[PDB]
Design a binder for this molecule. Structure first.
Ligand SMILES: O=C[C@H](C[C@@H]1CCNC1=O)NC(=O)[C@H](CC1CCCCC1)NC(=O)c1cc2ccccc2[nH]1
Ligand SMILES: O=C[C@H](C[C@@H]1CCNC1=O)NC(=O)[C@H](CC1CCCCC1)NC(=O)c1cc2ccccc2[nH]1
Lengths: 302, 302
């Protein structure tokens, strides 16, 4: 049972290079607009407390060098939406897919197409953590890389990369420029909260384990939602809501294990540990598969 | 530090559906040829000991229904190369990338574009295990999905999926139809060998850990290659060769830790365990990153 990313073809055709001054990063080229992090306009003497409105007034179109492969796109206009810059260009992208901008919920997963200099370098699956960080793999020059899901024929863009935190996790915005979490785009060490474990995702992954015949952790018991959430709080697990129990319903019915029965089993794994045993090859409980990810991997959604 | 797949766009445009009788699986459409597993021509009464030569003589072009999306490609001719069928079609694929067929080495990694009914469903990173299996995620209808690497602008196809084994791992061929390992395409339970751990890959991943500041496992010692390989044999780790020490050379020089020093540290992790500590977030030693994978992720190759 593998971490699986969406195929990345539709997104690869939207990535471009955006250079402003001594800074080069990635942009997302959809129709006649290139989206990128607004901090591309900062200079080293402006990192600590940028006034982006003043800084953007100081730039003109020709300070923004946009390239799509070997094609130089001319910037026609520039505007700021929250923490993203919108560079109007003289050419619409012929490879623009059907797309939408979505702001995902904590606990939800997406694929990240990691890019450098406008070129795709790799794709992997992430989760929006409960504290609105993501545990990504990003280097210098990775800003502007996007996270997305693919629904039918529609690419739903949900994340654009802006920064790394002192703990090595990552922070960014939706495609309207609003940061996930409390983070701000200035150069200062910023705390993410305590990160909690996405309980509904761990439950989905235990269901995946049962579907694939790995069932040693099942016990005879059940529990109430209330009794469970009291144990979960002690181990920094997110509370489980009735909506979560409903989301896990199909998985429960396919395996014949009621949700509150699986919760009882998870309760014991948290109190007793794993005594050196693994589940789906993992020595730790995994929480970056949603119930939909499990169903899609265990049923073969395309 | 994440398992990262290559971007899958170039490969997605080559996937087609291939139906023969009551069996539907994926084909790889390059120029005017569709490649697929030859077992697509089997019926349920022919699974146990197929005579493929006789079976293929019994088929005609019109028993092979090939579709690329909504386009029905007419089969013009059909031939068998080892365990893959080559279906000549009346149209060359306009989206054919620069490509080559390569037979990878055990220990080497590749990306798998998992497909059902000719449509890409997900992409993930695998390793060719020492016993020539892969630990994939494949369902019914996944045969014909391919594994690949991307070198510059060239897609190097290395794997096509054929079967799952009783242990739940997976077996298949190169794109010339030769199975990796001892496996044969008939319906019988087939043993893969003892699977050993890819020592050079574990060493690369320990180097990744150091590059990312996770260094608790380092010790004061060194070791000879010979003394190390004696411990490695006891824990079913592949032998480390001088070629491996040379492959790990750049990583050694970037971290300032000689290869045989890292080996000394690995020796102790194998004898003493991890006492409940993790490395790069993992409670087990990871062996499905090559030294090149590490360099590419820690340097940002595109
Ligand atoms: O692509 C460029 C990078 C991506 C980073 C870099 C290394 N790994 C990543 O994920 N973004 C950046 O380098 C941005 C640039 C921008 C400068 C102006 C105002 C706000 C931030 N800066 C940062 O991520 C960063 C600043 C910082 C200060 C204190 C502690 C951690 C920090 N991380
Ligand atoms: O796409 C079709 C599947 C992919 C499989 C199926 C479920 N998960 C996978 O990875 N291939 C298959 O289903 C092929 C079909 C073919 C039939 C004729 C001769 C040789 C094999 N059969 C198999 O993989 C298989 C047979 C078998 C017998 C004993 C123990 C394990 C086995 N696995």
């Amino acid at each position: 049972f593998r971490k699986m990313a969406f195929p990345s073809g539709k997104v690869e055709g939207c990535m471009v290079q955006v250079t402003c001054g001594t800074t080069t990063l990635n942009g997302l080229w959809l129709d006649d607009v290139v989206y990128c992090p607004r901090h591309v306009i900062c200079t080293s003497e402006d990192m600590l407390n940028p006034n982006y409105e003043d800084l953007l007034i100081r730039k003109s179109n020709h300070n923004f060098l946009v390239q799509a492969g070997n094609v130089q796109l001319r910037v026609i206009g520039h505007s700021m939406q929250n923490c993203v810059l919108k560079l109007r260009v003289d050419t619409a992208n012929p490879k623009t897919p059907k797309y939408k901008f979505v702001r995902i919920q904590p606990g939800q997963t997406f694929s990240v197409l990691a890019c450098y200099n406008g070129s795709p370098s790799g794709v992997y699956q992430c989760a929006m953590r409960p504290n609105f960080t993501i545990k990504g793999s990003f280097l210098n020059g990775s800003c502007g890389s996007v996270g997305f899901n693919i629904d039918y024929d529609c690419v739903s863009f949900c994340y654009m990369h802006h920064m790394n935190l002192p703990t090595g996790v990552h922070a960014g915005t939706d495609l309207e420029g609003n940061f996930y979490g409390p983070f701000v785009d200035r150069q200062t060490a910023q705390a993410a909260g305590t990160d909690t474990t996405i309980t509904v995702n761990v439950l989905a992954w235990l269901y995946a384990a049962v579907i694939n015949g790995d069932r040693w952790f099942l016990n005879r018991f059940t529990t109430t939602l209330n009794d469970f959430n009291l144990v979960a709080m002690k181990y920094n697990y997110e509370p489980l809501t009735q909506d979560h129990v409903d989301i896990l319903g199909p998985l429960s019915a396919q395996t014949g294990i009621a949700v509150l029965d699986m919760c009882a089993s998870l309760k014991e794994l948290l109190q007793n540990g794993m005594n050196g045993r693994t589940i789906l090859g993992s020595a730790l409980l995994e929480d970056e598969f949603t119930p939909f990810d499990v169903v899609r991997q265990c049923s073969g959604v395309t």
